[PDB]
Design a protein around this nucleic acid. Sequence first.
RNA 1: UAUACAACCAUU
Length: 631
Amino acid sequence: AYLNLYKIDIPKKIKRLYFYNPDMEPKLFARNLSRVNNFKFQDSNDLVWIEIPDIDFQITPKNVFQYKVEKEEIIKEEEDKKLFVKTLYKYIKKLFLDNDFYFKKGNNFISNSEVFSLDSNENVNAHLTYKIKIHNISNEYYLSILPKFTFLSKEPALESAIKSGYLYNIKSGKSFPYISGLDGILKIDINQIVEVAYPENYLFNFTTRDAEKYGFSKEVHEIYKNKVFEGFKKIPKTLGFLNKITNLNENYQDGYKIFINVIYKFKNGESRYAKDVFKYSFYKNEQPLKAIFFFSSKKQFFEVQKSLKELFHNKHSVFYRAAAELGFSKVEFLRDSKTKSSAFLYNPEEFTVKNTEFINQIEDNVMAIVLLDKYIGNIDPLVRNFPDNLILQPILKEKLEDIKPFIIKSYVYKMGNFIPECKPFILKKMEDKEKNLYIGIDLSHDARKTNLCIAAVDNTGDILYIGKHKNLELNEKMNLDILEKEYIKAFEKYIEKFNVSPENVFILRDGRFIEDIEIIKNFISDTKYTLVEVNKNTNINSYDDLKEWIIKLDENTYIYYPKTFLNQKGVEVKILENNTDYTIEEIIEQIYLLTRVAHSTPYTNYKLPYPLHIANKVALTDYEWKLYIPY
RNA sequence: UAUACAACCAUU
């Protein structure tokens, strides 16, 4: 099996050269040197310097040697790994820019010779693109080269017949929302609006959704299907200038890829297909399904009354068969003795509900089937204002109008998922993993603020605890205090549920641990644990099919490619630390199984381990996540 | 929003 990894063959050392110019301020001297070399120079109070790989590097202009200073320094990769990686990244960027590639944020390099206008839309250019990342595998350095495509307007924004919602800047590589382009003045979003001085440096960037929106997604899909493999194969010639640091003809090639078999245990059978839950019923149910209805108006009710009758007045409809198949003891639509109805109104303008005696006295698990007239752009008010004793279960009016069985089946599955006394399934390989506490960590720093969210689950997918903190002051010491506090809370929840400490604690991190790792290491404890870095955005891929495969890079680094009906995307898993009695291989398998310990619906599966999936989702919104995460 | 899907993500 091929991987898009390429071995870097250069001296593992960085050279720092110095220059001095008396006629010019050091910052300006460094800026001009950076511009002409496509490589950033740094400045001091008097000296300007550059850190380069220990390779032949001809600086521009030629006569710059007249400013060269005697001072030189050599830093081994041993003494400073990050400096070597930073320097190599900047060196790769320079080579691409020197060959007239455009740079785009994320180390995406847009080719300007491998460009063709789309047959479907004359005003759109399809630029062959390569995204480049640096990997440290088995004490050696590698370079992942992912062929992809960038669709840009052929003409600058003001001179482009077609338009989009995002502008790509040719110089900076950053993208900004497109506010307006009228009367020769182009305005971008920075929430600051700014008129631009060179609007010619801005092109329209077309995403997968715009291509659908502007009617050329068919050609966009075709290009991606059997014209990206040519991108993998065009690497040696198109990227030949990279011969300086690697041999593009020596590809990365028995038992370093294992297929993980996930079997679901239902009540009356087992399967590899989550959708067989309707064949063999919830692993645990015997619970009543209780529900009431909320409509945005009397009119909306009458618009869907026929479907409402077909679904809920026929006690043998697909809705009732789904609930029976999933193992619900009964289906009950509660009715207010006053109004004698199970149907109520909500204000679609304010997303509010009038509190009543009947609604207020509702106890236990009761689903609120809330009919939405259309997809709501800001659903936070609906969640925020809804009565907290009801389980909010919104559904689009149009999907009740047409009644596709798999949708109604999925809807009933979600309801079961949101009843804590239910368990749709347990994983066959997770049945003996109750002793472990699986924790996901989403922590970002942006301003001078910090955003934190943690989520803990057990071997069955039950959510033990979720903690979230908004707008913390960016300070390593303060942030790690709160981290410890939330971690202790999740720990106590496990004990609270299992009356014993977890024997092992899995800490899965969204990205890499950049905090004081030793501080974390100590307070994580007398409990055995493992520290795991998860990268949902890994650049390592292949033209081969790796879906549902786990690939070993080195002793502590794996990549799994979860099942998906979209493009093949990888998830990197790195065991930073481990003092559990599990081997790395066993830990990696448990992390992969965590992607299946719960389902939103049986027809799709999660890509990230469930605790991390929760942590990302809860951190993303103030209230919307309550629609997806049963907590 | 039954799922899913959302722009990028070491110069001015």
